[PDB]
Amino acid sequence: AAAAMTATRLASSYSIIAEEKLLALLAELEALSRQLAALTQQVSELREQQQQQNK
Amino acid sequence: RQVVDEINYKDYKAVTLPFQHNNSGFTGYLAPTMRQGQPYPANFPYPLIG
Amino acid sequence: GVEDELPNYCFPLNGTGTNSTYQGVKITNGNDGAEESEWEKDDAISRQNQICKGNVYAMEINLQANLWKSFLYSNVALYLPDSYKYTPANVKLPANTNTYE
Amino acid sequence: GVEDELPNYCFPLNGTGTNSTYQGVKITNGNDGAEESEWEKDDAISRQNQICKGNVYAMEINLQANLWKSFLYSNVALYLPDSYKYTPANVKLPANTNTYEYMNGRVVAPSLVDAYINIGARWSLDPMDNVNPFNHPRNAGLRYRSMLLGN
Amino acid sequence: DIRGVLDRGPSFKPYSGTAYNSLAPKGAPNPSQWETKEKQGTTGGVQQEKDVTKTFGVAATGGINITNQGLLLGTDETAENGKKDIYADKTFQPEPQVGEENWQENEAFYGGRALKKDTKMKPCYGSFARPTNEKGGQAKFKPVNEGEQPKDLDIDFAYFDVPGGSPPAGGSGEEYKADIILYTENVNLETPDTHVVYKPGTSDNSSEINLVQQSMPNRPNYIGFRDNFVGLMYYNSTGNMGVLAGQASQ
Amino acid sequence: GTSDNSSEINLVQQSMPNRPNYIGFRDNFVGLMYYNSTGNMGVLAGQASQ
Amino acid sequence: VDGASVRFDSVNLYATFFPMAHNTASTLEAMLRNDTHDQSFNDYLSAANM
């Protein structure tokens, strides 16, 4: 009877991205990319400049 | 109130609103419009007495 | 205003008020076209079962409004000053006013 | 529930809808067997004798059920929150929910709260438990001052 | 704060009236059938078969055309142009019908549901039938099985053609197929409260006489504790009194 | 039908009355005077030392 | 959800006393009844959990 009551009680108890974000994101990436390409040139020149003076 | 026990009672079938037919054939179907239908034994309100 | 949205209907005593009588037919072995449906002796035929075709006969009545009108007429409507009440054409009344007649 | 125990009948205006016609008969001195009638010329031999050979032509209606069912609809069914009520296909409605036009074309199924819901109980309908009860034609504290200004 | 579980007997009924088909006339018979003998023959050909049975078969819903499968509610997509009725639940839902319009609702073929002769037919007022499938399908007894297993539901088809048909079917007799179908089956018919007042005959088996059946609702009867709980705890009885003695002197 | 022209199809019209909607002033006129709104508040001063 | 539960049938409290001469248990009780010295313990964790 308690088990039957316990059996009774246990059961009884129981997005779309806006273009504003995207267009801003693309511009930031291009801005960083152009800066990154510029810094690569300076480093590449620096290695050549030392290399040629040593040679 | 005492509602029907859905768990500890076999042969219990959950009938939603647009299928239960009590007082059929004498009252409108899902609308306060004309009376449409065929007399027939009711099925929705489960008995709780007798 | 009297509150009423559900129409109230009166239904016949026999349940459906039907009058048309049909006869049983058992659609046979072949195609369900216009032939091949033939009757069988298993069902009644001549006074065979009558089936209501088409919903129950019925007639409705604005139940709530009728009570409101009836309450008005038995009440104040009858108690208006005598200048409004008119005597019927084919009846006669006593001359004096203050009398139940 | 509805305190109904007697059928309520509705009768034809003319007292009886039966329209049969008959003719008088004058069974003679012989034994009342099979061929003793004479149908004397004292009654309507053709038309006028109209008699209802059956019973009267009443039709029934549960008077008590309709009143309680109608009271339940207007007062507790039309005020359900705008998720149980649907919109008929052929009727167009405005956009915003607040406008009076919108909450006047969406119907509620009578198969909702009806004469057979929570029978014999004081249960307040749970769908409209969190619904402002002071917005009603029964808000007698309102229509007193609604009609005070006039009509 | 006594706390248990009580059980009001079968006599308990706290609502005056009925809950099932309360608006139906007190005497409207359920659409059903009654096996009987029908008098026929030129000089006597009485034949006990499915005679005047199915005497009430009120048919509300209509369809385009009746086939040997069902009612064929309406035409569909080109992939499957035929759409019969699921005789499990949506064979003929008793609520909907043709049109929901009185005028101009003339339909070529109608149909409905009815009760087999096995079910002892009772007045529509106060009749209940526990559903068998969650799709709203009315009570449908599993067909009589000896001891093996309950198989698919019990449903039968009955077709009723109008007796007066002038056109022969392509040179045949005066018969035709302009008819109305009826989904007949047995249900768990039971009246939880209402009781029959006027029973014309003696037996309750379905028959033409037993079609006449008027049943007033059961007499209401409330059950509950008494006021202020009188009588729940023994008072002024010498047999069993109850005490408030002190612990020490008792 | 999805039309309003006169025809037999449109002969079957069933119309319910619009649900009632009373419109009057609030009890005790709660609302007709600005109370506890900083944008606009009353004043009762002595007209000499304001 | 699946398994069953425990079911207490009887609970008893056990307590063992050091058998001490009544001559010195009265003296020890006399000391411990004094206001100056009384037992004092602290929770080992000694923290306020949030």
Question: How would you describe what is shown here?
Answer:
The structure is cut from a larger assembly and holds 1 copy of chain A (about 55 residues) and 6 copies of chain B. With about 55 residues, chain A is mainly alpha-helical. Chain A is about 85% helix and about 0% strand. Chain A is elongated. Chain A starts with a helix and ends with a helix. Chain B has about 50 residues and is largely without helices or strands. In chain B, about 0% of the residues lie in helices and about 0% in strands. Chain B has no helices and no strands. The two termini of chain B are about 15 Å apart. Classes of the chains: A mainly alpha (about 55), B little secondary structure (about 50). Chains in contact: A-B, A-G, B-C, B-D, B-E, C-D, C-E, C-F, D-E, D-F, E-F. At the C-E interface, strand 1, strand 2 and strand 3 of C face strand 6 and strand 7 of E.
Set out the fold topology.
The structure is cut from a larger assembly and holds 1 copy of chain A (55 residues) and 6 copies of chain B.
Chain A lengths: L1 H12 L5 H36 L1
Chain B lengths: L50
